[PDB]
């Protein structure tokens, strides 16, 4: 039933893309947005990313600033927030950067269809939470994260995970750093891919703030 | 800044600006290509004012088939203001239509005074061209698809100095990838549309990491429930 406070933070091009048509990472935001993202990571209890992001970018999801890591450790918490990968078939690579880098809890959320052999290998390095049939049940995952002490969850994204979280009615706020470039492309990942809403299913927002940061602009939206 | 910013006295083409309304996740319409409420009345008025000051509006054939817009100036006062200064009530209306599929009963042909231009490719069927020439100037450029650089040169040569691209995802890509666009205005509406196959502000092929198009933020203004971002086109990042 219950869930953490959940927000999406992503950086997108002016035409709404998270990455190119080849699924390759480009520089959307500068140092100042990277510092803001690091502050968010430091204050969040957990960070969540989809398997698509892990496979494309192999990110570590760590807090980068030594001062922020020390501030978290001084307050009793691990240097990094809990890192959560949403991954139905348990395909998270065993030598992924989320496993090589930093201290803290890792969680792989898999589906009940996931093969047992891969689940066991991952369980050496992470807590594995099983929900749903062929796909992770994000509502049940969310309540299970809240049960464990997670009150603040940052969805770092993935176009499809963003869709999954938003269409399930789980998100409280959306942060979009809009960068000063056009990426383009029909098949380029956008801020929200997945199936998409029809005319009668559209999700209303309210604009909370708009702040210019370096060469782009940060839009913060409250979900209705 | 390598992009040569054009103005009303530039030689090769009009000043060109894209205007669109999009969702907070970058979509122009749903995955069924259906129009939805993105902009409020104030953004509709801002759009209308832009139309009134432009010499020409350009849309892709896809927009004409999906939405059937007239592309007219709506306000009687804005039309009268154009008229009083010797202009046609409506700016020139241009459709980028490679295969000459613009319907003969399209709303572009029924509503309002002003010139109509159908830009077609050299390969478009001559039967459908001759039918279109009863209602419009037809201009042929490019072998199979409309050559937008050449089209832009021809619009300039006729005396068009200001071109509003009202877009569609594919035409926006065409103009942006050809290096033809000076400014980009996006009203960002207070909604999520979503969808992998939902049209975005710029679809088409897309840029690789070596051909990204750099912008500069000119202004950000809140309007009703959303926000208007205006971007100046700088050159390629490489
Ligand atoms: N610029 C930025 O801010 C930013 C941030 C993050 C990522 N990115 C980019 O985004 C791209 C990746 O996005 P993506 O859409 O491919 O992958 P993604 O959103 O990271 O992950 C999506 C995958 O998660 C799994 N999943 C499991 N249960 C789900 C559920 N209930 N709902 C939705 N998904 C579920 C699905 O695969 P299975 O069913 O097979 O598990 C799904 O395909 C990369 O190119 C990356 O660079 C950009
Ligand atoms: N709210 C807004 O601001 C707004 C405004 C307009 C549209 N929209 C939405 O956009 C959605 C989809 O638009 P769309 O992208 O599918 O249609 P579009 O961009 O209006 O039309 C694209 C078409 O232009 C023609 N074309 C010819 N030569 C070209 C070239 N060199 N480069 C690019 N295009 C060329 C092609 O058709 P041929 O090859 O057959 O000629 C192509 O399919 C619609 O559902 C509509 O609701 C929203």
Closest approach of chain A CAs to the CA of B100, in angstroms? 24
> Contact at 8 Å (CB) between B135 and B106?
no
Instruction: Verify whether the Cβ–Cβ distance B209 to A159 is below 8 Å.
Output: no
**What is the whole-number distance in angstroms between the Cα of residue A39 and the centre of ligand 1?**
23
DSSP E strands, chain A: 5-12, 46-50, 82-86, 106-111, 127-131, 152-157, 173-178, 181-182, 203-213, 216-223
Element (H, E) at A52: helix A51-57
Atom of ligand 2 nearest to the CA of B39: 1
Helices vs. strands in chain A: H and E counts, helices first: 7, 10
CA A108 – CA A114 distance, rounded (Å): 11
Q: B1-238 domain in CATH 3.40.50.880?
A: no
Dihedral Cα B25, A155, A22, B16, nearest 10 deg: 30
Q: Architecture of domain A1-224 in CATH?
A: 3-Layer(aba) Sandwich (3.40)
Inter-chain CB proximity A190 and B26 less than 8 Å: yes
List the A127-131 sheet strands across, edge first. Answer: A127-131, A106-111, A82-86, A46-50, A152-157, A5-12, A173-178, A216-223, A203-213, B191-192
Please enumerate in sequence order all residues whose Cβ is within 8 A of that of A182, keeping only pairs 6 or more positions apart, or say none: A13, A14, A15, B176, B184, B202, B207, B212, B213, B215
DSSP structure string for B141-207: -SSSS--HHHHHHHHHHTT--EEEEEE-HHHHHHHHHTT--SEEEEEEESEE---TTS-BSS-SS--
Please, which residues 8-67 of chain B have a Cβ atom closer than 8 Å to chain A?
22, 24-27, 30-32, 34, 36
Q: Does A213 touch chain B (CB under 8 A)?
A: no
The residue written with tokens 């792989």 in the block is A108
Q: Tell me which residue in A12, A183, A216 faces B217 most closely, judged by beta carbons.
A: A216
Q: H or E segment at B51?
A: helix B41-53
Burial track A73-85 (b if 16+ CB lie within 10 A, e otherwise) = eeeeeebbbbbbb
Residue of B nearest to A223 (CA): B191
The answer to whether the Cβ–Cβ distance between A221 and B24 falls below 8 Å is yes
A142 annotated as ligand-binding? no
* Residue labelled with tokens 């054009």: B6
> A202-209 — which CB contacts under 8 Å span 24+ positions?
A202/B36, A202/B191, A202/B192, A202/B193, A203/A166, A203/A167, A203/B191, A203/B192, A203/B194, A204/B190, A204/B191, A205/A174, A205/B24, A205/B190, A205/B191, A205/B192, A206/B190, A206/B225, A207/B190, A207/B222, A207/B225, A207/B226, A207/B227, A208/A173
Resolution (A): 2.3
**Does the annotation flag A135 for ligand binding?**
yes
Which residue's CA lies nearest to atom 38 of ligand 2?
A: B98
Distance, CA A152 to ligand 1 centroid (Å)?
A: 20
- Interface contact A196-B193, CB threshold 8 A: yes
Give residues after which chain A gaps, C-N over 2.5 angstroms: none
Other CB atoms within 10 Å distance of the CB of residue B182: 19
Method for this entry: X-ray
Structural domain boundaries in chain B: 1-238
**How far apart are the CA of B59 and the centre of ligand 2, in A?**
7
For residue B49, give both structure tokens: 């004012």
DSSP H/E element including B213: strand B213-223
Ligand 1 centroid–CA A137 distance in Å is 14
Nearest CA to ligand 2 atom 29: B146
Residues of B in contact with A172 (CB under 8 A): none
Mutating to test ligand 1, I would choose from A15, A16, A17, A86 the residue with most ligand atoms within 8 A of its C-beta, which is A86
Determine the atom of ligand 1 nearest the C-alpha atom of A177. Answer: 3
Q: CB of A167 within 8 Å of any CB in chain B?
A: yes
Q: What are phi and psi of B143, to 5 degrees?
A: -70, -60
């Amino acid at each position: 039933m219950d869930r953490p406070f959940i927000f999406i933070n992503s950086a997108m091009s002016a035409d709404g893309k998270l990455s190119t048509k080849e699924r390759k990472q480009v520089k959307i935001s500068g140092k100042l947005d990277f510092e803001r993202m690091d502050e968010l990571r430091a204050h969040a209890d957990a960070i969540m990313v989809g398997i698509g992001t892990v496979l494309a970018d192999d990110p570590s999801l760590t807090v980068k600033s030594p001062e922020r890591k020390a501030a978290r450790k001084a307050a009793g918490k691990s240097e990094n927030p809990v890192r959560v990968v949403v991954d139905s078939s348990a395909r998270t690579p065993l030598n992924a950067d989320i496993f090589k880098k930093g201290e803290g809890l890792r969680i792989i959320a898999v589906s009940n269809s996931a093969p047992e052999e891969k689940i066991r290998m991952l369980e050496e390095k992470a807590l594995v939470i099983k929900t749903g049939a062929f796909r992770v049940d994000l509502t049940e995952l969310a309540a299970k994260l809240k049960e464990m002490g997670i009150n603040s969850l940052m969805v770092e994204g993935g176009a499809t995970l963003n869709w999954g979280m938003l269409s399930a009615g789980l998100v409280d706020e959306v942060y979009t750093f809009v960068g000063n470039l056009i990426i383009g492309g029909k098949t380029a990942p956008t801020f929200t891919d997945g199936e998409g809403f029809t005319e009668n299913e559209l999700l209303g927002l309210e604009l909370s703030s708009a702040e210019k940061i370096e060469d782009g602009i940060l839009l913060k939206w409250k979900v209705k």
